[PDB]
Amino acid sequence: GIDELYKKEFGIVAGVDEAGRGCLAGPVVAAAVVLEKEIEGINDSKQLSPAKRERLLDEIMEKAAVGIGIASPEEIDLYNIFNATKLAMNRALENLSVKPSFVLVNGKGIELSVPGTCLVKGDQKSKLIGAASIVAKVFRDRLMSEFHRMYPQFSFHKHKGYATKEHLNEIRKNGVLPIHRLSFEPVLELLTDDLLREFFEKGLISENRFERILNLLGARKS
DNA sequence: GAATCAGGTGTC
Ligand SMILES: [Mn+2]
Ligand SMILES: [Mn+2]
Ligand SMILES: [Mn+2]
């Protein structure tokens, strides 16, 4: 119903949500979702079972229009997690085929390239956002799994890059990766100016990424 | 799914 109020008022209304905010690795995934056909079971992903999201997505990506945006781990470091988040969100709206006259954005304090509004707990106040919530999360998880493929020594399919005990084990044992968020404190902690220069000399990170994390590295213990 | 332990950073 919340959706319908805004639908009647503003016209085409997209729901937006993102996943991967609190992660130590990988990009942040945002999803924009416009939908008219009803989908029973709609609810914020984190209440659902991983396998149910799966069946709800197949359904969602059949009755709805969906845009997907991502922001690079490099962009998180250079821009911060928040602007990287808005950036990802705006890339989703961009990828959406339907151009909404209005957006419902989960959270607070986010203003996108499309006039809209910000709902706290929006992912459980709105069906569109709850749906955008399931798209982001599943798509993200998928990105992380194939990262276990690219870095076999890493349980990215289990911990999704988050600060779990075993993720921190895999980092101390195996080292820090370019896809880790180098500005994120637990990583900054383990990283050395020596590995940082290597990343750069290998052409793995950017000159701008290097300068930041380097300046961040020397700023430690302050 | 809910409880409760862990672990991240942006806004203001
Ligand atoms: Mn929520
Ligand atoms: Mn959510
Ligand atoms: Mn900070």
Residue spans per domain, chain A: 1-222
Amino acid sitting at position A102: F
Resolution in A: 2.8
- Proximal ligand: closest to the CA of A20: 2
C-alpha–C-alpha distance, residues A15 and A109, integer Å: 15
C-alpha–C-alpha distance, residues A33 and A179, integer Å: 27
Pairing outcome for strands A13-19 and A102-106: parallel
The token pair at A63 is 């009755």
Query: What spacing in Å lies between the alpha carbon of A183 and ligand 3's midpoint?
Result: 9
Residues A76 and A183: beta-carbon distance below 8 Å: yes
Q: Name the packing angle between helices A50-63 and A127-150 (round to 10°).
A: 120
CA-based max dimension of chain A: 58
Indicate the burial class of A133 (C-beta count within 10 angstroms; 0-12, 13-18, 19 or more). buried
CATH number of A1-222: 3.30.420.10
Say which experimental method was used.
Answer: X-ray
Residues forming beta bridges with residue A105, ordered by sequence position: A16, A118
Contacts of A56 (CB under 8 A, 6+ apart): A39, A41, A42, A48, A134
The whole-number Å distance from A76's CA to B9's C1' is: 11
C-alpha–C-alpha distance, residues A153 and A209, integer Å: 24
The token pair at A108 is 């607070």
Amino acid sitting at position A115: P
Q: Locate tokens 């990215």: which residue?
A: A156
Amino acid sitting at position A26: G
- What DSSP string runs through A80-117? -HHHHHHHHHHHHHHH-SS--SEEEEESSS---SS-EE
Protein residue closest to B1, using CA and C1' = A47
Instruction: Report the 10 Å Cβ neighbour count for A213.
Output: 23
C-alpha–C-alpha distance, residues A124 and A54, integer Å: 18
CA A111 remoteness from chain centre:
17
Give, as ranges, the nucleotides of chain B with any atom within 7 Å of a protein CB: 1-2, 7-12
C-alpha–C-alpha distance, residues A181 and A93, integer Å: 25
Residues A116 and A103: beta-carbon distance below 8 Å: yes
